[PDB]
Amino acid sequence: GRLPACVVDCGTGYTKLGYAGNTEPQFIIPSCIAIKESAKVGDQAQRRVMKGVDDLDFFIGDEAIEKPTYATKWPIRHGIVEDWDLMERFMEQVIFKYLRAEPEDHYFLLTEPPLNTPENREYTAEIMFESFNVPGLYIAVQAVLALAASWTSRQVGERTLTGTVIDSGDGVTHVIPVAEGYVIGSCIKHIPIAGRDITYFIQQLLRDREVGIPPEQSLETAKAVKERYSYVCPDLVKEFNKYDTDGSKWIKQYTGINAISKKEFSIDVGYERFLGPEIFFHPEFANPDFTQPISEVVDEVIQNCPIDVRRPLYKNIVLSGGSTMFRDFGRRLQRDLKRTVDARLKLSEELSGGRLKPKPIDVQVITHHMQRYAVWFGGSMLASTPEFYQVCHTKKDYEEIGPSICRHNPVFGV
Amino acid sequence: MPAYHSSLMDPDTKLIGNMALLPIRSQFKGPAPRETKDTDIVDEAIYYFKANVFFKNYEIKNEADRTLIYITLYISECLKKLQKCNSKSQGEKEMYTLGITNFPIPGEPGFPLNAIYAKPANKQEDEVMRAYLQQLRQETGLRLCEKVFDPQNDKPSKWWTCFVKRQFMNKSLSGPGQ
Amino acid sequence: MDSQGRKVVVCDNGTGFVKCGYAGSNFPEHIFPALVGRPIIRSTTKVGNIEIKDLMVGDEASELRSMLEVNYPMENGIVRNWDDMKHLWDYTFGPEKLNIDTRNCKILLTEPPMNPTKNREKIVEVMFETYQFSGVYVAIQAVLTLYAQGLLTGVVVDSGDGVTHICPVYEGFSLPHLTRRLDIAGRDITRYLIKLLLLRGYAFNHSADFETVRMIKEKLCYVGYNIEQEQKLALETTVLVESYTLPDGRIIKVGGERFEAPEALFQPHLINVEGVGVAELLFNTIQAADIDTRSEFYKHIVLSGGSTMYPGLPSRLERELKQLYLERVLKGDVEKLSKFKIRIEDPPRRKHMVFLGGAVLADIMKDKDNFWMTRQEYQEKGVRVLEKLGVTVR
Amino acid sequence: DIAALVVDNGSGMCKAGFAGDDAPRAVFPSIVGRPRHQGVMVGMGQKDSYVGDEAQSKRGILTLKYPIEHGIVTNWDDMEKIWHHTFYNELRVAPEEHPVLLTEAPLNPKANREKMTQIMFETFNTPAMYVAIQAVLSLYASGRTTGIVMDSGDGVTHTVPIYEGYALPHAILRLDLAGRDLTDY
Amino acid sequence: MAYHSFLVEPISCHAWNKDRTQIAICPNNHEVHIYEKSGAKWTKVHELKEHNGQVTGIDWAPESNRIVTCGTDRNAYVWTLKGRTWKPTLVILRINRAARCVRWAPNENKFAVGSGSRVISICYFEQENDWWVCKHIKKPIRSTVLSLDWHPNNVLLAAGSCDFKCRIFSAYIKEVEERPAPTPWGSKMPFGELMFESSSSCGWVHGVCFSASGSRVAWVSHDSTVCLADADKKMAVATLASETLPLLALTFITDNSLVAAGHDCFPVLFTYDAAAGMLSFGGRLDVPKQSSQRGLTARERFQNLDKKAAGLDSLHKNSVSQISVLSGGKAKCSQFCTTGMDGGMSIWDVKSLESALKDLKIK
Amino acid sequence: ARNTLSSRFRRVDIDEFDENKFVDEQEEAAAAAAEPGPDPSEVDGLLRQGDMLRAFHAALRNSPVNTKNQAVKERAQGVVLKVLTNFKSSEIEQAVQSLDRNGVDLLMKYIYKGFEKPTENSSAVLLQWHEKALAVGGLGSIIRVLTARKTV
Amino acid sequence: TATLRPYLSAVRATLQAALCLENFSSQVVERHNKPEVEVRSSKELLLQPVTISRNEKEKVLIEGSINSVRVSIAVKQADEIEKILCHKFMRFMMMRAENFFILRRKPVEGYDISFLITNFHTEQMYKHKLVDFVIHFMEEIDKEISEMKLSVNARARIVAEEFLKNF
Amino acid sequence: WXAXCPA
Amino acid sequence: WXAXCPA
Ligand SMILES: Nc1ncnc2c1ncn2[C@@H]1O[C@H](COP(=O)(O)OP(=O)(O)O)[C@@H](O)[C@H]1O
Ligand SMILES: Nc1ncnc2c1ncn2[C@@H]1O[C@H](COP(=O)(O)OP(=O)(O)O)[C@@H](O)[C@H]1O
Ligand SMILES: Nc1ncnc2c1ncn2[C@@H]1O[C@H](COP(=O)(O)OP(=O)(O)O)[C@@H](O)[C@H]1O
Ligand SMILES: [Mg+2]
Ligand SMILES: [Mg+2]
Ligand SMILES: [Mg+2]
């Protein structure tokens, strides 16, 4: 008989492991690896050669953050794997320790961001096909699986196959318009500004103002401040004024534990309540290359799709990923989008001569019960169908053509 | 989304060089007329300062924007000196003796924005611009010394001295980082 | 200059570049990009010695783009911004350009085919009310290209920065039902190159970086010949990687992109345009003409426009046309293919053919009074004076 | 290639330059001056801390303090002042764009290099740094990969033997005796 | 005698003026750089920038002072010196592939451009229209035309090709010059005629050269063979197969002796014995120089111990690509200039070379 | 996106049907009257007798360096390889030094044509042959081997 | 080594009989400048492909041209472990084919590795040093693969000792 | 444009 | 230092 396919959604800040056919990932670990690192001289490809069996003395996931004598490395940066040695070791413990899957009896469904270079896919195919020897692989785009995770929380008869998926993870934020089940790939947008940029901005804010934060935790604090006291503001300068004139109400206190002497430190959370998420509607706060808000990027995405599929795309904007769990994020997004759309419609009516008043475009932003792991569940659907075993790259295909079998994805033509 | 520009340009506003000689509600001497409405350019600059320091693109649209740019650049100099003080009665003296200190004007070495600031055409316009900038500096320091210092402990509040490292578009009226 | 001392200017007003001069000239007197910039401050750039006015236009607005926010007043041949276009025209007829008194000059303007009529109407209105020209004519671009080449028959494939259009003409009689207009040109190729470079980790998101990517596409990119062979070169070898130094100082590497960005002219589906390439569109345009004109249309394929200057575009176009002809006319008879005679006339100065044709036509018709639209006719009729050209508007 | 600032900044005199040259671009005594008399002539401009050569020239009315003693940073505010003067006044370069290669004597307390890294990353925001041992660099400069370096600075003396590149860390001898002790003697 | 390295990138081609005081070179890009001899050092005086692709042929007419440049943009330009700047006049070649070589005629009335379109373009002037026009010689040619050299009678034209054959065409233009006099090559000389065609079928022909008197035509092949066809002997071929790497350029220093160079980087000398009809290896011209070694500093020792864990005994460190005759003509030469793919420019001397080696006799 | 129109007209390679392509000429006398090359019977007779130098010279007496027939070329190549790979490793220098320049320029071709179809020890001796022939003839021989248009 | 000495001498002498490259612009396309051995567009700019073999299964195929040389190497592979290691090693060499300027991202079918030296690599880089690199690769590849094999054996022994120690 | 495409 | 010597 057949065994369920393994689903491994490898994200920059968190990896979701499971067996296809379930409702939620069996494991959600941090995407980090603790290896023994010491003071050495020479290149990186030369000091990584470990004598004996010392290359198996490493940990991953939750067990890699606890280890205080190991060095913690993150192999994935901005969704693109920058280190393949650490990624191979991470994958081998993901398969042989957590999933406990024999990699020769299970099809694998990995994930990727839209702008993953083809050489990354070729290296992933080389790893899964020659090292782990999987009978089949399928590298699906991350946000396109997040659409089929909003159907579990919406009433019957309004579970559509058309919508704009906004996936904001730890390292990348991408916008994918799906229409009737077909990924409109030539309209996908991809911005490397995401949760971790918010965490760097927040720690730089805290470090310029607060005192008493242990250095070795200056990041771990900026996550607990970001994922707890952060919201979205309707206006920036008005919020600065609201904090200045009535600071006794808007300024909160965060009390953490210094995990060396177990003492407690206390800091004041002020402007970084609303300046964190604001790098979504002002990306220049974290990366001066991008200057375009997320509402305008979504509007460009939808306005580039075919005409008669623009009106349903506005109706089912599905959020996904952790970085979209900010209070009143969807509300401000929908407000800006409604402003843009109504202004465009009124301009078109005025240019027409003033005879017809067209239907106001319904704009809706869908928050659902599965956002934190909306991608994985989507995979758990796709990798549970029969047709799945018809779209995978069989081992024969790799043995015949080579890793170049995995070189194409729906973002580029030919 | 664009930064916060000033909305005080009027078609009858006079120009000095290419900066809007906007009226100001102050007590110091200067060539700028007196204001009757409850908001001058300095109040607007102090209102928009905390937000304008985080942006990294600032399109100059009119001359009132150039005046607001100058005042936003000078608040960053006031903050550097107010960070060291420990009593509002000393902050006021520091702000006075800083406003007196002559900073470079458009068309001189050390001014960060010579490219986008029209220098004076003669000596009279030079003198008027010097006096106008001095009045702006004095009144901005005077107004800011009442914002930075909170009355609970009468020393610079950490909510204003955290913007000492934040530079408006990485420009400054002082030296390059000194 | 005519017999009245009234200078006869010729101005091309392209979406991506203005080429202006006088009648009878052999080369455009001024070729400068058509973009208007406004000064801005950026946290990554620092300049404090070059005087930057509140409004830079044209050449200086492109060379000084690092400290400006630039925008084109034209797009797809349709003027999107009228104030910026008026500034560009003020600069064109200004002292630091063609220096003319517009009250006593005639002008020869152009326009792509199949363009909204309000555009031409407003351009003529502006030329007669703002600059108060003494005479204006709006000629057709393919007609001017055939004037410059020195022909009376041929199928002009004019691919500018803003728009590609294929216009056949036979014995001097314009066939307006065969005029095809594909909306892929230099600018869409530049955007596709920006996408491809973003796949490599470089971000060109500002208004100024667009000109940097344009100057990259102009130096490095080229149209492939046998796209299977080019893909084999890009995937198997490493002889296509070439370095380019950005203005700031960064060194980028461009590889297979060199032949993937300009391929969107022959395979539009790469940039989400549902249609046929320029070669298949040319072949369908020809095969839509009467049987007695196809054999002469095949022998006078006149290339024009800057976007046809990619290294190896004539040869690739010829190969594509020969393959289409072999499969869809000879139905697969290789013996007869050697008898098929194409001639893709790609002159060396094919980047300014429209201006040279305008210069020839103006040198011919400067001294007539039934050719130009006179200012008096405008003051009497309004936008109806355009009926002189053959375009009927009320 | 990238240009990386090399800031020796041993005790006694700070010598900073760019990587790739043959001599430090700026060499100045690492001292900090403080006025010890009242200011009476107002309007001439005054400063409350002179650094480097300026503090040396005006030493007649200052209390020169060395921020480093016996190879250890003992006053971090004056050390930050020295580094700021090195970055923005001597080299006149933005420190947030170039890596920094600092030097430290062997067998110093770990808190020294820890606070050094913290200062160089949280105050000047250098994109990368590296703390090398002085004698190893001294051996680099001599163009040989074997020998015993005997480095006698202004506040610390130490010897490091190296053979074929493999430095022996169990025979590094340090001795707090250098130019300042000789000056006092 | 000297060696001067203008740049590290190859030099495509070079040309001297009448008094050998200025040189025009290609920096391996679109520009043409004109340097001037100022005492002992060279100083760039002019930059000519009109081409779209890198120039592949430059030639300087001595008497009229007009430069001709052909490049890979399928175009040719004639630069004339107006006052202080060189202004270009465009020539319409009507080729559809990259040009390869250009050569002025001896009388400076026309010039020949060999291109990769399997044609030769004989360009001349039309003063009735101020129009640089061209005619085509394209019949027996089946590949690129690599090298050109004109007969001293302004009509015949030697052309080497990548089709393994050296040919002697007749470039007679009946609108710029009179009917030519009969030569030992043939009495019938219409435009485009074929007077001689070598019998070789192996190796490309990198360089051809007519004799000083126009009675002998010599050429070099990639087959390592140097050949000479004599016209006073029923067009008889004398071949010499070398045992070194191939040659790229050659010239006639006398009516009996040749100076070739190539992928060896040093000039060699050959001789022709008319009384027997056979070439003789006169021998290497350059004396093998001993390149001084330098002690390494510590910065360079570690720089090339980390990064990488002269071999040639001549002036040029890369293959020599072009040989010209500086002074003395082809009847009795005294100085010849060589430029190669290392950016260097070696001004040789025949007297000093003959003095250094006494085992070296110039026929 | 993807293309939903017929793109099969791009697979036809018209360049192989070109009329301006390069065709390698051959002489009419060399195409009509083909040279049979060496006489193999004489070679086996001179080998059985036990004279190596004369069999070597008889292998290089005449060669199909003008014909276009594959059978004669392959047979001549086989005979000359049978002579080359059967010498003692000592008498190779003497046999090489008994050849004119053209003899060496042809021996190098017969060597480089023996590497393409090797046997248990054919290449181990052809390498010594190449060593001696390169010592005598230099890189010019290898270049006259590369830039040849008719292979033997 | 000393058993590859005549084979490597022949390969080196054939390498610097080719690699006499020149600049050349294409004939079948307007302005492209492409390596003539990769496109195989013109049959007149292609020299004879010469093979140099030490035995039946170790060889070098050299394909010359006017502006390019393609050198394909078929390496010794004695058993299956050496075959696997040679495949993986050549693959890890191809991965960095822009640091190796003369390398080729895919080997010619039938051969283990392939170098493609155009004329720019002989104008901008030392020619004799490229020849030396090719010959050094051919010298040392067998030794390095044998050391890989010994490393695999040592890993197997250590794994066996790590298991049988717990009993 | 006004309808269809931008211009 | 903290113990021994000053620094
Ligand atoms: N409730 C929340 N509010 C704000 N940010 C969050 C929340 N939960 C997670 N994040 C941020 O999102 C990132 C992890 O989300 P995830 O979707 O797992 O990204 P990825 O899948 O790329 O690792 C972290 O950077 C985290 O700080
Ligand atoms: N040599 C070239 N190769 C490829 N593209 C070019 C080249 N030159 C110009 N272009 C593109 O075409 C445009 C110029 O063509 P042009 O005909 O001047 O456009 P317009 O329609 O504005 O006149 C530029 O914007 C550029 O993107
Ligand atoms: N040329 C010299 N001759 C004698 N003493 C010197 C000389 N140069 C420096 N010194 C003394 O050596 C002392 C310490 O040397 P120094 O180089 O300052 O140490 P560091 O390298 O740590 O700065 C100085 O105080 C100085 O007085
Ligand atoms: Mg994710
Ligand atoms: Mg145009
Ligand atoms: Mg020292």
mmCIF file of all heavy atoms in Angstrom, chain E residues 14-15 34 39 74 93 102 115 120 141 149 153 162 217 239-240 256 276 301-302 306 332-333 336 339 356:
data_model
loop_
_atom_site.group_PDB
_atom_site.id
_atom_site.type_symbol
_atom_site.label_atom_id
_atom_site.label_comp_id
_atom_site.label_asym_id
_atom_site.label_seq_id
_atom_site.Cartn_x
_atom_site.Cartn_y
_atom_site.Cartn_z
ATOM 1 N N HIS E 14 46.860 49.041 -36.104
ATOM 2 C CA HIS E 14 47.529 50.321 -35.924
ATOM 3 C C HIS E 14 47.925 50.884 -37.278
ATOM 4 O O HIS E 14 48.018 50.161 -38.273
ATOM 5 C CB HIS E 14 48.797 50.130 -35.089
ATOM 6 C CG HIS E 14 49.914 49.479 -35.838
ATOM 7 N ND1 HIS E 14 51.144 50.074 -36.007
ATOM 8 C CD2 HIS E 14 49.989 48.281 -36.464
ATOM 9 C CE1 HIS E 14 51.931 49.270 -36.695
ATOM 10 N NE2 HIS E 14 51.254 48.174 -36.986
ATOM 11 N N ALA E 15 48.168 52.192 -37.302
ATOM 12 C CA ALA E 15 48.552 52.869 -38.536
ATOM 13 C C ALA E 15 49.376 54.107 -38.214
ATOM 14 O O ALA E 15 49.072 54.837 -37.272
ATOM 15 C CB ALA E 15 47.325 53.262 -39.358
ATOM 16 N N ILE E 34 44.729 58.099 -31.071
ATOM 17 C CA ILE E 34 45.870 58.630 -31.801
ATOM 18 C C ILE E 34 46.839 59.204 -30.782
ATOM 19 O O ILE E 34 46.532 60.194 -30.107
ATOM 20 C CB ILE E 34 45.446 59.693 -32.824
ATOM 21 C CG1 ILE E 34 44.665 59.051 -33.967
ATOM 22 C CG2 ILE E 34 46.660 60.407 -33.378
ATOM 23 C CD1 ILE E 34 44.106 60.054 -34.930
ATOM 24 N N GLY E 39 59.278 63.451 -27.801
ATOM 25 C CA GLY E 39 60.571 63.115 -27.245
ATOM 26 C C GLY E 39 60.793 61.620 -27.178
ATOM 27 O O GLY E 39 60.968 60.963 -28.211
ATOM 28 N N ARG E 74 29.593 46.975 -39.435
ATOM 29 C CA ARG E 74 29.295 46.953 -40.865
ATOM 30 C C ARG E 74 29.431 48.330 -41.503
ATOM 31 O O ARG E 74 28.770 48.623 -42.501
ATOM 32 C CB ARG E 74 27.899 46.390 -41.131
ATOM 33 C CG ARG E 74 27.709 44.965 -40.667
ATOM 34 C CD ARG E 74 26.343 44.453 -41.067
ATOM 35 N NE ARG E 74 25.269 45.170 -40.388
ATOM 36 C CZ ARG E 74 24.408 45.968 -41.007
ATOM 37 N NH1 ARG E 74 24.496 46.153 -42.317
ATOM 38 N NH2 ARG E 74 23.459 46.582 -40.317
ATOM 39 N N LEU E 93 29.059 50.713 -47.188
ATOM 40 C CA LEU E 93 29.679 49.482 -47.657
ATOM 41 C C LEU E 93 28.683 48.495 -48.244
ATOM 42 O O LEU E 93 29.060 47.702 -49.112
ATOM 43 C CB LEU E 93 30.439 48.800 -46.515
ATOM 44 C CG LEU E 93 31.611 49.554 -45.894
ATOM 45 C CD1 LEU E 93 32.220 48.745 -44.764
ATOM 46 C CD2 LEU E 93 32.657 49.864 -46.940
ATOM 47 N N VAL E 102 41.051 46.886 -43.762
ATOM 48 C CA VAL E 102 40.974 48.026 -44.667
ATOM 49 C C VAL E 102 42.383 48.408 -45.101
ATOM 50 O O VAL E 102 43.346 48.266 -44.342
ATOM 51 C CB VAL E 102 40.250 49.227 -44.021
ATOM 52 C CG1 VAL E 102 41.077 49.815 -42.898
ATOM 53 C CG2 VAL E 102 39.932 50.277 -45.059
ATOM 54 N N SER E 115 35.662 42.087 -45.820
ATOM 55 C CA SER E 115 34.655 41.868 -44.794
ATOM 56 C C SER E 115 34.335 40.386 -44.687
ATOM 57 O O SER E 115 34.792 39.566 -45.487
ATOM 58 C CB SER E 115 33.376 42.654 -45.092
ATOM 59 O OG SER E 115 32.507 41.900 -45.914
ATOM 60 N N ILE E 120 34.715 41.771 -51.192
ATOM 61 C CA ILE E 120 35.659 42.868 -51.002
ATOM 62 C C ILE E 120 35.004 44.133 -51.529
ATOM 63 O O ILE E 120 34.378 44.120 -52.596
ATOM 64 C CB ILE E 120 37.003 42.610 -51.713
ATOM 65 C CG1 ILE E 120 37.531 41.224 -51.377
ATOM 66 C CG2 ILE E 120 38.018 43.669 -51.326
ATOM 67 C CD1 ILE E 120 38.946 40.986 -51.843
ATOM 68 N N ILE E 141 35.210 34.240 -54.074
ATOM 69 C CA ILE E 141 35.419 34.229 -52.633
ATOM 70 C C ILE E 141 34.324 33.409 -51.964
ATOM 71 O O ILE E 141 33.148 33.493 -52.331
ATOM 72 C CB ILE E 141 35.452 35.669 -52.089
ATOM 73 C CG1 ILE E 141 36.674 36.402 -52.632
ATOM 74 C CG2 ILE E 141 35.489 35.667 -50.580
ATOM 75 C CD1 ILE E 141 36.653 37.875 -52.372
ATOM 76 N N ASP E 149 46.602 43.699 -49.460
ATOM 77 C CA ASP E 149 47.790 44.480 -49.779
ATOM 78 C C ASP E 149 47.759 44.812 -51.260
ATOM 79 O O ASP E 149 47.530 43.925 -52.087
ATOM 80 C CB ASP E 149 49.074 43.730 -49.424
ATOM 81 C CG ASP E 149 50.285 44.635 -49.399
ATOM 82 O OD1 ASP E 149 50.119 45.841 -49.112
ATOM 83 O OD2 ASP E 149 51.406 44.149 -49.660
ATOM 84 N N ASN E 153 51.164 49.234 -58.657
ATOM 85 C CA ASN E 153 50.552 49.871 -59.816
ATOM 86 C C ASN E 153 49.102 50.264 -59.583
ATOM 87 O O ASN E 153 48.374 50.503 -60.552
ATOM 88 C CB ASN E 153 50.658 48.962 -61.049
ATOM 89 C CG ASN E 153 49.645 47.840 -61.044
ATOM 90 O OD1 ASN E 153 49.221 47.368 -59.988
ATOM 91 N ND2 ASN E 153 49.248 47.400 -62.230
ATOM 92 N N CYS E 162 39.643 32.974 -45.406
ATOM 93 C CA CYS E 162 39.467 31.801 -44.568
ATOM 94 C C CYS E 162 39.087 30.569 -45.372
ATOM 95 O O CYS E 162 38.866 29.506 -44.791
ATOM 96 C CB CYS E 162 38.404 32.067 -43.498
ATOM 97 S SG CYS E 162 39.017 32.825 -41.981
ATOM 98 N N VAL E 217 54.307 37.745 -54.703
ATOM 99 C CA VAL E 217 53.267 37.835 -53.684
ATOM 100 C C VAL E 217 53.510 36.742 -52.647
ATOM 101 O O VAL E 217 53.533 35.555 -52.980
ATOM 102 C CB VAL E 217 51.856 37.720 -54.293
ATOM 103 C CG1 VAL E 217 51.751 36.513 -55.196
ATOM 104 C CG2 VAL E 217 50.808 37.655 -53.195
ATOM 105 N N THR E 239 57.137 27.058 -51.224
ATOM 106 C CA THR E 239 56.562 26.914 -49.897
ATOM 107 C C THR E 239 57.633 26.498 -48.900
ATOM 108 O O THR E 239 58.599 25.816 -49.261
ATOM 109 C CB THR E 239 55.430 25.881 -49.894
ATOM 110 O OG1 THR E 239 55.000 25.647 -48.549
ATOM 111 C CG2 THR E 239 55.895 24.575 -50.510
ATOM 112 N N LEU E 240 57.458 26.917 -47.652
ATOM 113 C CA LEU E 240 58.323 26.502 -46.555
ATOM 114 C C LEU E 240 57.448 26.168 -45.364
ATOM 115 O O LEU E 240 56.699 27.030 -44.882
ATOM 116 C CB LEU E 240 59.336 27.589 -46.194
ATOM 117 C CG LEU E 240 60.270 27.231 -45.042
ATOM 118 C CD1 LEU E 240 61.011 25.943 -45.343
ATOM 119 C CD2 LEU E 240 61.249 28.356 -44.782
ATOM 120 N N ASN E 256 64.030 40.262 -51.555
ATOM 121 C CA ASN E 256 64.438 38.874 -51.385
ATOM 122 C C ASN E 256 64.134 38.308 -50.004
ATOM 123 O O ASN E 256 64.118 37.084 -49.847
ATOM 124 C CB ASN E 256 65.934 38.734 -51.666
ATOM 125 C CG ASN E 256 66.249 38.678 -53.145
ATOM 126 O OD1 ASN E 256 65.347 38.634 -53.980
ATOM 127 N ND2 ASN E 256 67.534 38.683 -53.476
ATOM 128 N N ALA E 276 66.860 29.268 -57.489
ATOM 129 C CA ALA E 276 66.404 27.914 -57.207
ATOM 130 C C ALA E 276 64.910 27.808 -56.956
ATOM 131 O O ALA E 276 64.359 26.711 -57.112
ATOM 132 C CB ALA E 276 67.150 27.337 -55.999
ATOM 133 N N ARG E 301 53.848 38.490 -1.214
ATOM 134 C CA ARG E 301 54.043 37.083 -0.874
ATOM 135 C C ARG E 301 52.777 36.486 -0.285
ATOM 136 O O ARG E 301 52.335 35.410 -0.700
ATOM 137 C CB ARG E 301 55.213 36.929 0.098
ATOM 138 C CG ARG E 301 55.122 35.678 0.951
ATOM 139 C CD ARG E 301 56.341 35.509 1.839
ATOM 140 N NE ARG E 301 57.403 34.769 1.170
ATOM 141 C CZ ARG E 301 58.565 35.301 0.804
ATOM 142 N NH1 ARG E 301 58.815 36.580 1.040
ATOM 143 N NH2 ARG E 301 59.475 34.552 0.197
ATOM 144 N N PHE E 302 52.148 37.187 0.659
ATOM 145 C CA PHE E 302 50.916 36.657 1.229
ATOM 146 C C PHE E 302 49.750 36.789 0.252
ATOM 147 O O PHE E 302 48.827 35.968 0.262
ATOM 148 C CB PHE E 302 50.604 37.353 2.549
ATOM 149 C CG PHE E 302 51.299 36.739 3.726
ATOM 150 C CD1 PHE E 302 52.521 37.219 4.150
ATOM 151 C CD2 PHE E 302 50.740 35.668 4.394
ATOM 152 C CE1 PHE E 302 53.165 36.652 5.226
ATOM 153 C CE2 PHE E 302 51.378 35.096 5.468
ATOM 154 C CZ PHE E 302 52.593 35.588 5.884
ATOM 155 N N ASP E 306 47.883 33.332 -0.601
ATOM 156 C CA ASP E 306 46.469 33.121 -0.311
ATOM 157 C C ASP E 306 45.670 32.890 -1.587
ATOM 158 O O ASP E 306 44.842 31.978 -1.655
ATOM 159 C CB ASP E 306 45.912 34.320 0.456
ATOM 160 C CG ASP E 306 44.405 34.307 0.536
ATOM 161 O OD1 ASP E 306 43.826 33.236 0.824
ATOM 162 O OD2 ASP E 306 43.788 35.366 0.303
ATOM 163 N N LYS E 332 64.214 48.625 -49.497
ATOM 164 C CA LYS E 332 65.283 48.481 -48.518
ATOM 165 C C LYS E 332 64.820 49.041 -47.181
ATOM 166 O O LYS E 332 64.924 50.246 -46.936
ATOM 167 C CB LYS E 332 66.558 49.182 -48.993
ATOM 168 C CG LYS E 332 67.753 48.982 -48.073
ATOM 169 C CD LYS E 332 69.063 49.298 -48.775
ATOM 170 C CE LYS E 332 68.952 50.545 -49.636
ATOM 171 N NZ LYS E 332 69.974 50.564 -50.717
ATOM 172 N N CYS E 333 64.306 48.175 -46.315
ATOM 173 C CA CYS E 333 63.718 48.620 -45.063
ATOM 174 C C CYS E 333 64.783 48.732 -43.976
ATOM 175 O O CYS E 333 65.792 48.020 -43.971
ATOM 176 C CB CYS E 333 62.608 47.671 -44.628
ATOM 177 S SG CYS E 333 62.063 47.902 -42.921
ATOM 178 N N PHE E 336 60.831 48.334 -38.749
ATOM 179 C CA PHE E 336 59.485 47.795 -38.847
ATOM 180 C C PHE E 336 58.858 47.718 -37.467
ATOM 181 O O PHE E 336 59.511 47.357 -36.482
ATOM 182 C CB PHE E 336 59.459 46.414 -39.521
ATOM 183 C CG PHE E 336 60.345 45.393 -38.872
ATOM 184 C CD1 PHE E 336 59.845 44.538 -37.910
ATOM 185 C CD2 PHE E 336 61.664 45.261 -39.256
ATOM 186 C CE1 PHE E 336 60.651 43.589 -37.321
ATOM 187 C CE2 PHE E 336 62.476 44.316 -38.674
ATOM 188 C CZ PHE E 336 61.970 43.478 -37.703
ATOM 189 N N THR E 339 52.787 45.153 -33.658
ATOM 190 C CA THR E 339 51.788 45.278 -32.605
ATOM 191 C C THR E 339 51.096 43.939 -32.430
ATOM 192 O O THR E 339 50.774 43.268 -33.416
ATOM 193 C CB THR E 339 50.756 46.366 -32.912
ATOM 194 O OG1 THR E 339 49.791 45.864 -33.840
ATOM 195 C CG2 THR E 339 51.423 47.594 -33.492
ATOM 196 N N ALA E 356 73.502 42.512 -33.919
ATOM 197 C CA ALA E 356 73.517 41.672 -32.729
ATOM 198 C C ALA E 356 73.822 40.219 -33.075
ATOM 199 O O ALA E 356 74.546 39.538 -32.339
ATOM 200 C CB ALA E 356 72.181 41.778 -31.995
#
